[PDB]
Design a protein around this ligand. Structure first.
Ligand SMILES: Nc1ncnc2c1ncn2[C@@H]1O[C@H](COP(=O)(O)OP(=O)(O)OP(=O)(O)O)[C@@H](O)[C@H]1O
Lengths: 86, 224, 52
């Protein structure tokens, strides 16, 4: 089968065949996406040339997310623009 | 007028046949997911159902219905015999297919284990010469036992994996190819090796069987 | 005309017989792998089918 397996938060190198997941090759159409906190773990799993660094959110996105974690009573005293308050 | 009643019965037969085909196809797909090949009888039944082509007779009946405005118009009454025969043939064929399909209980069978079982294919570098030497000893060798030795961590198990995966391409008279990892212990875990050999020989693995008796049985089995 | 219908029935019979032969041969090979000799009645049936 053509499988897409999303390994989540790997923390040590582990053999994919031992658990049962076949390592995809260029001759096969399967893709295996894995996430980890460590560059070393990503390199050890033969992912060295398809590595993505998860960048942190920007200022605008940060502010938009921060508002969503406030009650309407408090959001009313922070959201308004035009007038400037401390 | 039995033609209209028989065509309504044929429509009900198409609906029932579609339902039965859906059920049997679902079970066959379930069996295939377990790596079991579909039962040949079920395959024949599916082939017969796929070729029933009831839409052709349906479209012919639609074309006749285009001209079915007056019964006294005996100009088109000759086509009634053709419809009157094909409708009944389709109906009884569909009912036979229904009766055969509803009675099926086994939908797949475990295929015989392949000659060569695929093993992981790691990208090698400069293994061609070693593969050529190993193949030369494997083919022209007068001695049946071949030993490969090297420093720790130097291409050995990888060499075996590549050789095993390459045996698939070439033609050979070797019926069964078995890959056994005695590396798992220095105590010679015999049960694991016997399990691997039995699984690769399609033999029925037993738990309570004594080790020596299983060894003798496997010696007799591999000797053939 | 019963000849064409009978020949179509014969074709369906060939397909069904091939399926049954495949199943029985698979089971016989499974029994042989266990070092069990094939049942003589099944051998006679296979001989009759092969000679059809
Ligand atoms: N030609 C090659 N190209 C790339 N990597 C290779 C090659 N040959 C061996 N390796 C690497 O060697 C590593 C060790 O595997 P290998 O089969 O060589 O071990 P070994 O020498 O049999 O080990 P041991 O003696 O511990 O059983 C593997 O990770 C494999 O990727």
């Amino acid at each position: 089968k053509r499988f897409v397996i999303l390994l989540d938060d790997v923390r040590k190198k582990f053999c994919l065949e031992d658990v049962g997941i076949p390592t995809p090759d260029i001759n096969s159409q399967s893709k295996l996406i894995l996430t980890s906190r460590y560059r070393e773990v990503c390199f050890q799993m033969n992912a060295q040339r398809s590595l993505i660094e998860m960048q942190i959110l920007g200022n605008d996105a940060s502010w938009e997310l921060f508002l969503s974690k406030l009650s309407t009573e408090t959001s009313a005293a922070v959201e308004p623009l035009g007038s400037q308050s401390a | 007028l039995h033609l209209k009643s028989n065509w309504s019965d044929l429509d009900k037969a198409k609906k029932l046949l579609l339902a039965v085909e859906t059920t049997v196809r679902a079970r066959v797909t379930a069996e295939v997911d377990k790596l079991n090949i579909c039962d040949p009888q079920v395959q024949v039944w599916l082939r017969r159902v796929e070729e029933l082509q009831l839409d052709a007779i349906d479209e012919d009946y639609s074309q006749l219905r285009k001209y079915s405005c007056l019964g006294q118009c005996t100009i088109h009454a000759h086509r009634r015999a053709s419809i009157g025969r094909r409708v009944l043939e389709a109906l009884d064929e569909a009912n036979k297919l229904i009766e055969e399909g509803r009675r099926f209980k086994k939908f797949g069978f475990k295929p015989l284990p392949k000659i060569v079982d695929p093993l992981p294919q790691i990208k090698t570098f400069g293994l061609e010469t070693m593969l050529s030497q190993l193949y030369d000893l494997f083919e022209k060798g007068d001695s049946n036992i071949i030993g490969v030795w090297g420093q720790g961590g130097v291409g050995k198990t990888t060499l075996l994996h590549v050789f095993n995966n390459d045996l698939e391409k070439k033609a050979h008279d070797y019926q069964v190819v078995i890959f056994i990892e005695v590396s798992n212990s220095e105590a010679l875990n015999t049960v694991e090796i016997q399990q691997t050999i039995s699984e690769r020989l399609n033999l029925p693995w037993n738990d309570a069987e004594p080790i020596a008796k299983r060894a003798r049985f496997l010696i007799k089995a591999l000797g053939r």
